[PDB]
Scaffold this motif. Structure first.
Motif, short mmCIF file in Angstrom:
data_model
loop_
_atom_site.label_atom_id
_atom_site.label_comp_id
_atom_site.label_asym_id
_atom_site.label_seq_id
_atom_site.Cartn_x
_atom_site.Cartn_y
_atom_site.Cartn_z
N UNK A 134 0.91 -0.92 -0.10
CA UNK A 134 -0.16 -0.14 0.19
C UNK A 134 0.28 1.29 -0.08
N UNK A 135 1.81 1.25 0.06
CA UNK A 135 2.60 2.56 -0.12
C UNK A 135 3.15 3.03 -2.08
N UNK A 136 3.03 4.47 -1.43
CA UNK A 136 3.76 5.21 -0.77
C UNK A 136 2.52 5.52 0.38
N UNK A 137 3.12 6.01 1.46
CA UNK A 137 2.28 6.66 2.89
C UNK A 137 2.23 7.89 2.36
N UNK A 138 2.24 8.97 2.30
CA UNK A 138 2.10 10.55 2.52
C UNK A 138 1.88 10.89 4.40
N UNK A 139 2.02 10.23 5.18
CA UNK A 139 2.08 10.75 6.15
C UNK A 139 2.18 9.72 7.11
N UNK A 140 3.59 9.58 8.65
CA UNK A 140 3.42 8.51 9.54
C UNK A 140 1.76 8.51 10.11
N UNK A 141 1.00 9.37 10.38
CA UNK A 141 0.24 9.24 10.75
C UNK A 141 -1.24 8.72 10.01
N UNK A 142 -1.16 8.62 8.46
CA UNK A 142 -1.82 7.77 8.02
C UNK A 142 -1.36 6.22 7.59
N UNK A 143 0.15 6.03 8.05
CA UNK A 143 0.87 4.77 8.12
C UNK A 143 0.34 4.31 9.02
N UNK A 144 0.35 4.75 10.27
CA UNK A 144 -0.45 4.15 11.53
C UNK A 144 -1.47 4.20 11.39
N UNK A 145 -2.43 4.94 10.36
CA UNK A 145 -3.39 4.27 10.75
C UNK A 145 -4.32 2.77 9.88
N UNK A 146 -2.89 3.21 8.33
CA UNK A 146 -3.27 1.64 7.37
C UNK A 146 -3.13 0.60 9.03
N UNK A 147 -2.40 0.67 9.60
CA UNK A 147 -1.49 -0.53 10.13
C UNK A 147 -2.28 -0.97 10.92
N UNK A 148 -3.72 -0.26 11.69
CA UNK A 148 -4.30 -0.56 12.92
C UNK A 148 -5.40 -1.61 11.76
N UNK A 149 -5.78 -0.40 11.11
CA UNK A 149 -6.29 -1.80 10.18
C UNK A 149 -6.16 -3.16 9.20
N UNK A 150 -4.80 -2.87 8.97
CA UNK A 150 -4.43 -4.20 8.46
C UNK A 150 -4.76 -5.24 9.97
#
Length: 150
Positions: free
Chosen positions: A35-51
């Motif tokens: 799912x890269x690229x991630x545009x911000x660390x917050x958005x990466x963390x939110x995606x990680x929680x969903x996963x």
């Protein structure tokens, strides 16, 4: 810790390797990498929680499979009472559930860990799968937060 832009530009294999210590579930890391690229660390963390939101017992078992049990790392007063109660609770937990006691430890005192261990030993098997998964999610997130910066 590597920058988010570095994470975005790694090869798929280097990126999965960076994520691997967060939890021993290759599919989770593979999903985030895809799912890269991630545009911000917050958005990466939110995606990680969903996963990790729908991990179940099979993922708990795979994630913990290589975790050392009691007696598998032989080293050769109130502090004694606490150490004894923690070691005894861990022994009871492993005998009951056939798995290591998994708890997010950072931020909890030894006495708080003992209290959580004692409470969880009163759970049914299904209640404890759920709590152990929640702790696995918390640990994975704390590790991810130390792995990739802004």
């Amino acid at each position: 810790m590597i920058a988010l832009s570095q994470f975005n530009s790694l090869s798929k294999d280097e990126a999965a390797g960076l994520l691997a210590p967060c939890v021993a579930l290759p599919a989770w890391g593979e999903t985030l990498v895809s799912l890269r690229p991630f545009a911000s660390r917050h958005a990466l963390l939110q995606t990680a929680r969903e996963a990790m939101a729908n991990w179940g017992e099979d993922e708990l078992n795979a994630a913990l499979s290589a975790h050392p049990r009691i007696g598998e790392k032989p080293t050769g007063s109130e502090n004694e009472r606490l150490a004894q109660a923690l070691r005894e609770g861990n022994a009871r937990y492993e005998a009951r559930f056939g798995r290591v006691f998994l708890i997010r430890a950072k931020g909890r005192s030894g006495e708080e860990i003992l209290q959580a261990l004692t409470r969880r030993l009163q759970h049914t098997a299904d209640e404890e799968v759920a709590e152990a998964l929640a702790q696995l999610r918390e640990i994975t997130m704390l590790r991810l937060e130390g792995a990739i910066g802004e």
